[PDB]
Amino acid sequence: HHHMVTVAVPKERAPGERRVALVPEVVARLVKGGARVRVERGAGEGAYHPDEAYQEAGAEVVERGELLKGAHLLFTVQPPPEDLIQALEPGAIVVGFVQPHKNLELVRALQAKKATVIAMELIPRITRAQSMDALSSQATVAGYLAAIHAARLSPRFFPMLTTAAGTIRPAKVMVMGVGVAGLMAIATAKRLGAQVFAYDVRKAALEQALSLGAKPIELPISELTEEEKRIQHEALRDHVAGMDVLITTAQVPGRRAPILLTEDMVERLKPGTVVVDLAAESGGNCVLTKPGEVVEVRGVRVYGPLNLPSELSVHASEMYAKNLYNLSSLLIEKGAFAPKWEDEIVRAALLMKEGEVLHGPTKALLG
Amino acid sequence: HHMVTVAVPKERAPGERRVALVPEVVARLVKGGARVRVERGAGEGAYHPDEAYQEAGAEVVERGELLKGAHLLFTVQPPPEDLIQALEPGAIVVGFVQPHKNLELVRALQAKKATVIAMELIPRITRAQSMDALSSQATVAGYLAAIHAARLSPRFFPMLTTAAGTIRPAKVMVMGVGVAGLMAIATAKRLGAQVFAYDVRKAALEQALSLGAKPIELPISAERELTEEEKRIQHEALRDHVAGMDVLITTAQVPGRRAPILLTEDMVERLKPGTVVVDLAAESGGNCVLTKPGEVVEVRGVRVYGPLNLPSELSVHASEMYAKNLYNLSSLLIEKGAFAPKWEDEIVRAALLMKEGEVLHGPTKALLG
Amino acid sequence: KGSLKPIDVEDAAVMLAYAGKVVFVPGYGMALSQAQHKLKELADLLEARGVEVKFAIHPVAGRMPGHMNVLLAEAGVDYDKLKDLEEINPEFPTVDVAVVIGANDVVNPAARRPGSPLYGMPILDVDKAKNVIVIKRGQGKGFAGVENELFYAENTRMLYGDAQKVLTELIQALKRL
Numbered sequence A: 001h002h003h004m005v006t007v008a009v010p011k012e013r014a015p016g017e018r019r020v021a022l023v024p025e026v027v028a029r030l031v032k033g034g035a036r037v038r039v040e041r042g043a044g045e046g047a048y049h050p051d052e053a054y055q056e057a058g059a060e061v062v063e064r065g066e067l068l069k070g071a072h073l074l075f076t077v078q079p080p081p082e083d084l085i086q087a088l089e090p091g092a093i094v095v096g097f098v099q100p101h102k103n104l105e106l107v108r109a110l111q112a113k114k115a116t117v118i119a120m121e122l123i124p125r126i127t128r129a130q131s132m133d134a135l136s137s138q139a140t141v142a143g144y145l146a147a148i149h150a151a152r153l154s155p156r157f158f159p160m161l162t163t164a165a166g167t168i169r170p171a172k173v174m175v176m177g178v179g180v181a182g183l184m185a186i187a188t189a190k191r192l193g194a195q196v197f198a199y200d201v202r203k204a205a206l207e208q209a210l211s212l213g214a215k216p217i218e219l220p221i222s223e224l225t226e227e228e229k230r231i232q233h234e235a236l237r238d239h240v241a242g243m244d245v246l247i248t249t250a251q252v253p254g255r256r257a258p259i260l261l262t263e264d265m266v267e268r269l270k271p272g273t274v275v276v277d278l279a280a281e282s283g284g285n286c287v288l289t290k291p292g293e294v295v296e297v298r299g300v301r302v303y304g305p306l307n308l309p310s311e312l313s314v315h316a317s318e319m320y321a322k323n324l325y326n327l328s329s330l331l332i333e334k335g336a337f338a339p340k341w342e343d344e345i346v347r348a349a350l351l352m353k354e355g356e357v358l359h360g361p362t363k364a365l366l367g
Numbered sequence B: 001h002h003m004v005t006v007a008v009p010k011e012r013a014p015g016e017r018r019v020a021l022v023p024e025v026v027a028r029l030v031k032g033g034a035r036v037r038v039e040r041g042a043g044e045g046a047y048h049p050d051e052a053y054q055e056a057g058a059e060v061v062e063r064g065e066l067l068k069g070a071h072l073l074f075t076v077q078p079p080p081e082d083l084i085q086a087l088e089p090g091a092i093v094v095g096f097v098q099p100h101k102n103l104e105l106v107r108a109l110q111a112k113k114a115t116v117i118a119m120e121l122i123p124r125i126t127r128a129q130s131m132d133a134l135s136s137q138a139t140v141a142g143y144l145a146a147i148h149a150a151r152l153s154p155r156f157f158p159m160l161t162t163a164a165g166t167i168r169p170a171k172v173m174v175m176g177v178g179v180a181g182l183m184a185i186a187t188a189k190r191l192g193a194q195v196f197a198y199d200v201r202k203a204a205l206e207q208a209l210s211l212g213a214k215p216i217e218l219p220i221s222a223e224r225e226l227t228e229e230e231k232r233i234q235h236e237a238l239r240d241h242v243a244g245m246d247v248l249i250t251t252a253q254v255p256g257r258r259a260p261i262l263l264t265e266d267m268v269e270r271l272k273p274g275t276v277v278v279d280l281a282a283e284s285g286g287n288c289v290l291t292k293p294g295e296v297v298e299v300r301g302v303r304v305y306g307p308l309n310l311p312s313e314l315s316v317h318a319s320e321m322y323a324k325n326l327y328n329l330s331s332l333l334i335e336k337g338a339f340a341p342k343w344e345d346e347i348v349r350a351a352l353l354m355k356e357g358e359v360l361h362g363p364t365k366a367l368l369g
Numbered sequence C: 001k002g003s004l005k006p007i008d009v010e011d012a013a014v015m016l017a018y019a020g021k022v023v024f025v026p027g028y029g030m031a032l033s034q035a036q037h038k039l040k041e042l043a044d045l046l047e048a049r050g051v052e053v054k055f056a057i058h059p060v061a062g063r064m065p066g067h068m069n070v071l072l073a074e075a076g077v078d079y080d081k082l083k084d085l086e087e088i089n090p091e092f093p094t095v096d097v098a099v100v101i102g103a104n105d106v107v108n109p110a111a112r113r114p115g116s117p118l119y120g121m122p123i124l125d126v127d128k129a130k131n132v133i134v135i136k137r138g139q140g141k142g143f144a145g146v147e148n149e150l151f152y153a154e155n156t157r158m159l160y161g162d163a164q165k166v167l168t169e170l171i172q173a174l175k176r177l
Ligand SMILES: NC(=O)c1ccc[n+]([C@@H]2O[C@H](COP(=O)([O-])OP(=O)(O)OC[C@H]3O[C@@H](n4cnc5c(N)ncnc54)[C@H](OP(=O)(O)O)[C@@H]3O)[C@@H](O)[C@H]2O)c1
Pocket: B126, C026, C027, C028, C029, C030, C032, C033, C059, C060, C061, C062, C063, C064, C065, C066, C067, C101, C102, C103, C104, C105, C106, C107, C135, C136, C137, C138, C139, C140, C141, C142, C143, C144, C161, C162, C163, C164
């Protein structure tokens, strides 16, 4: 025997955040499955989903102060702020990105409150769980706009064009770090006609890049003598030198972004070259990167976008809402609030339960 | 006279980043027998450093020395007064002129006894194709219109299938299908958008189809001045089609006139929040009532951008193409390294705005009146 | 003058099956027909058969700058196969077969002559190729509205039909040889 589930969706308040956790169409599937959904007034305005639309879906549109009343599930994009945290009831689970390193004081308040929270970034990167993988779906969004921003900042055409005014050679675009984002960056730059090169340590990511028609960058080998490291560095610096665009995406969870473009490297870039550093949020792959800014040094234009998913706020929210919807198969059963504690996915993503932090590295950072 | 010498200045117009010749072209002129003078820093907007012009055989000089002994002044925008006042006798200015935007510069040129070829006036004949600077720069504008639209849109252009579901392609309407419109259709199409085309000319619609775009089919034949009743029918049908788009790229401009309105206020009211408009006609009024030239504005959730110097964003390839156009045209001004303007050539005749202070172009004449 | 010499896809297939060097010359008509995918597939087939294949892209082929490039890039044709006339022209005498797909003006040898409204346009020397097959639907003129003596040359054969449909049949007949 379980309670009948109420799901709550707040309006996001983090600076420059425009996504919403559920979109109306996804609310409607939940309602039709038997759940109640409450939504904060104007929650989806950043994603162009008016309150009227959520009502047509079957939601109750409510004021913020009333949002967590009788609520079993709080679906968020960013972690909830203090005002929502204090209104959390017994038995309620917060589901959304948490990212402790960035939001530690919120994590603390959730623990003092004795909350239960599933962190979306802790969804295990496995087969059974791709439909729920919020990092991927937002990685795909970021890689797409990364390619779009590069073409916008580049003073050169991407495509080859043969014209009465001469033959235009295609841009040389190198994607460094070919995870989910990089692969969408490849597909997008390729759609635009660029010649695309792909750089990654893993052979699998390179085979994947190959399938999209990118040319993989092979270093002289692939710890190492200091000298082999230098040969290895030099060869990469050489490949980068002849590019018009670098899109860089390498990010390691919980640590600073690796530097892939050092000072001696960017000194070899021709004036007019463009760098789009998708890793700016954890320090950047490029030593010239200023998070949230565009800078030009020696006519090399370097952009460190933060919150790309928020630019594509309609599709970013749709996909994230879908991720939450699929994840809810583990939290909702025939309209009943029934968390599957035993499930591998829940176990991997369960950040804290009743105040008990179950995630080792978060436990450490809080200490 | 002598060795022909051609001059190229640093452009000064607001936002202007192109340069009239790039190093590779400068080098070809020097090889052919021309002396080239280039203002200090002229190629910087386009990432061509003074040293690169020196390597091509150019002398690099101060702006005040630019015109000394020069027979040809190649510009992007019309020369400002400081350059007009330094033009030597028999010298020819070649560049865009746009007297509607620059009447008083055109008057100063006339008072100076200047001779000018306006690039906007290059005739549409086969011989002139490789000189068509309106076309080269529009190709850039159309490309970047599609890019900016994808950048301002809160939706994917392409259809996407992932584990998390299927996303529909964006619906893009290109309104006004000249060169800029065609390159916009092509770029948006390649990005995977579903692309529609609105233009009155059937041939323009056939060309949009040759890019996998879909002609917007209205009720009345647009190929004739319409009755007040038929206009109502066309406007209502078109408004319906515009209503269902995620993106509108408007590109219709008429030489010497304010842009036609293609998106009236009753139309934009039908646009959904999150819809994007990229108004390429902003330099001349704009096709959309909401356009603020040089700005992005948002009203009722509709993002409207009216960019003014897209060619200067793509400064490298715009300058490259432009320089090639002037290089090609210079075959009518230079013969074996000597100043030799073919006054009789139809291309020169069509584009010669002024000759030693006498205004030959009727519309410009009227304007100076 | 000379004569139009219609040819059957099966004859075009035989010509192509035994050639050492083929140059493909796309024009507006390929674009109108949206035949770029069928074209790339024919170029894959010949290449797999050991045929040396290139694309000759005229500066003003189509109706917009870089018209052929964008369609061929969409089809997945490698940039390295696309040549402009400065690079491809001198190579023409050695081309065993030149296949024209919906091109007309950009291969009209009358452009070398002053009276033609095409004069002053550089031309692709398709007329210096060993053999020419021209694909178009029939008698349609090009943009300039002039007749094209190339279609009447001794070494030129007309392969009439829609460009996508013709290329599909050509592929099908080639896989049967
Ligand atoms: N590229 C540019 O930017 C630009 C701009 C302005 C002007 N132009 C001019 O446009 C012309 C382009 O030359 P081009 O050789 O590409 O084209 P073209 O000289 O206009 O001829 C194209 C040919 O395509 C054939 N065709 C039409 N539909 C077809 C189909 N479905 N399947 C097979 N063939 C088809 C037509 O004959 P049928 O009716 O017998 O099928 C026509 O002969 C040049 O004259 C250039 O000066 C170009």
